[PDB]
Enzyme design. Sequence first.
Site, short mmCIF file in Angstrom:
data_model
loop_
_atom_site.label_atom_id
_atom_site.label_comp_id
_atom_site.label_asym_id
_atom_site.label_seq_id
_atom_site.Cartn_x
_atom_site.Cartn_y
_atom_site.Cartn_z
N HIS A 65 1.48 -13.23 -18.20
CA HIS A 65 1.07 -14.63 -17.91
C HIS A 65 1.03 -14.91 -16.40
O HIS A 65 1.72 -15.78 -15.94
CB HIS A 65 1.99 -15.61 -18.64
CG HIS A 65 1.67 -15.67 -20.10
ND1 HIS A 65 2.44 -15.04 -21.08
CD2 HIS A 65 0.63 -16.21 -20.75
CE1 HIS A 65 1.91 -15.25 -22.25
NE2 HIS A 65 0.80 -15.95 -22.09
N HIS A 118 -4.19 -12.78 -15.19
CA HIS A 118 -4.53 -13.45 -16.47
C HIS A 118 -5.33 -14.74 -16.19
O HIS A 118 -6.30 -14.99 -16.88
CB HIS A 118 -3.26 -13.67 -17.27
CG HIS A 118 -3.47 -14.52 -18.46
ND1 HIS A 118 -4.15 -14.06 -19.55
CD2 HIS A 118 -3.01 -15.75 -18.78
CE1 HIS A 118 -4.14 -15.00 -20.49
NE2 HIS A 118 -3.46 -16.04 -20.05
N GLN A 150 -0.22 -5.46 -34.11
CA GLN A 150 -1.59 -5.75 -33.58
C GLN A 150 -2.57 -6.08 -34.72
O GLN A 150 -3.20 -7.15 -34.65
CB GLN A 150 -1.98 -4.59 -32.67
CG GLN A 150 -1.24 -4.59 -31.33
CD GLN A 150 -1.40 -5.91 -30.61
OE1 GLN A 150 -2.46 -6.21 -30.08
NE2 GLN A 150 -0.38 -6.76 -30.69
O1 LIG Z 1 -0.30 -9.46 -29.56
C1 LIG Z 1 -0.14 -10.68 -29.54
N1 LIG Z 1 0.65 -11.38 -30.45
C2 LIG Z 1 1.27 -10.77 -31.52
C3 LIG Z 1 1.71 -9.47 -31.68
C4 LIG Z 1 2.22 -9.41 -32.97
N2 LIG Z 1 2.10 -10.56 -33.62
N3 LIG Z 1 1.49 -11.41 -32.71
C5 LIG Z 1 1.29 -12.77 -33.12
C6 LIG Z 1 1.14 -13.10 -34.49
C7 LIG Z 1 1.00 -14.44 -34.82
C8 LIG Z 1 1.03 -15.41 -33.82
C9 LIG Z 1 1.19 -14.99 -32.50
N4 LIG Z 1 1.33 -13.69 -32.13
C10 LIG Z 1 -0.77 -11.51 -28.45
N5 LIG Z 1 -0.40 -12.80 -28.41
C11 LIG Z 1 -0.97 -13.60 -27.49
C12 LIG Z 1 -0.53 -15.05 -27.48
C13 LIG Z 1 0.93 -15.35 -27.25
C14 LIG Z 1 0.32 -15.66 -28.56
C15 LIG Z 1 -1.90 -13.14 -26.57
C16 LIG Z 1 -2.26 -11.81 -26.59
C17 LIG Z 1 -1.69 -10.95 -27.53
N6 LIG Z 1 -2.03 -9.58 -27.66
C18 LIG Z 1 -2.78 -8.74 -26.80
C19 LIG Z 1 -3.25 -7.50 -27.22
N7 LIG Z 1 -3.98 -6.67 -26.44
C20 LIG Z 1 -4.18 -7.10 -25.20
N8 LIG Z 1 -3.77 -8.25 -24.67
C21 LIG Z 1 -3.06 -9.06 -25.47
MG LIG Z 2 -0.23 -20.46 -22.16
ZN LIG Z 3 -3.00 -17.82 -20.97
#
Ligand SMILES: O=C(Nc1ccnn1-c1ccccn1)c1nc(C2CC2)ccc1Nc1cncnc1
Ligand SMILES: [Mg+2]
Ligand SMILES: [Zn+2]
Length: 313
Positions: free
Chosen positions: A68, A72, A269
Amino acid sequence: GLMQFTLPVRLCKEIELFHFDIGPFENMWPGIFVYMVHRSCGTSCFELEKLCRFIMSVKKNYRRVPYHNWKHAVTVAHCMYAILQNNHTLFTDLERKGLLIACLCHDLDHRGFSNSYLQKFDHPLAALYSTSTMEQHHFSQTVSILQLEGHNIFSTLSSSEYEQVLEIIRKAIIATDLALYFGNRKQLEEMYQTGSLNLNNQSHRDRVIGLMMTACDLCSVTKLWPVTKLTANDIYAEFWAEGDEMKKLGIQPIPMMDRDKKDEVPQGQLGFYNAVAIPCYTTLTQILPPTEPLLKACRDNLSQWEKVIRGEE
Ligand SMILES: O=C(Nc1ccnn1-c1ccccn1)c1nc(C2CC2)ccc1Nc1cncnc1
Ligand SMILES: [Mg+2]
Ligand SMILES: [Zn+2]
Ligand SMILES: [Cl-]
């Protein structure tokens, strides 16, 4: 005003692609943002000296966190630049102005902790803002910076235009609260499948911008596989630090925040692409068909995580 911003040839071509990576040279990201503002909005949208001062104050109020961070902010702004360039007829003058700024400011002063952690921790911000705690703080930081001497980048607007663009920025920033995105996306889906979706209706525009904000915020899952894979290490580095802090409060963190469950990341993922990312870009493609390349690159990454789970890489 006959000094125009240019990029080297490879950045000039590739900045138009949804899957552009802004690179590892921090000192080129201000130039890339100005360039995107000049082509997106116009060379007349902002006074260069005010915009440059605003950009540098914003950079200084992002923190040295793994995901963050300043990189980003610019990345999210660039995804918004691509959406704006490939749908140029759909947006007003004020929307172009506000939305690139909203994206640059949307995570101002992030410490890499979720709204949940601030509540459990009983952080002062949770008392000030009961919902969308961090997103309300980011908007408040945006407003403080706009009120610094020499930083009123909207000084050429009337009072009522200024107020409107700050209402677009406020709503765009609140919409990066992922807890709001599920509701917003379900509502746009119904609206689209019933034919009531209407872009001359301000409450519907608000919902579409909301969705664009989530799409831009998550756009790390829409880069080429080697970018997406490397940026996942950065989000997990934050998640696991938050789960450590949860364990320190005597609370079991949720699985994606437990660094002992590191081997379940690929399955994590999949869960995230199926429940959040894929539906997000499907809906955005339905409403703005030229954003299709975001959904395509997201599908390809989901396909790559499936290859990791079956031990093919
Ligand atoms: O991986 C992420 N979240 C996550 C992993 C497992 N469950 N889960 C999840 C399930 C439900 C709700 C919220 N998160 C992820 N989250 C977010 C924003 C914080 C929410 C932004 C990016 C993200 N991934 C990512 C992957 N590749 C490259 N850059 C970024
Ligand atoms: Mg935010
Ligand atoms: Zn953001
Ligand atoms: Cl952190």
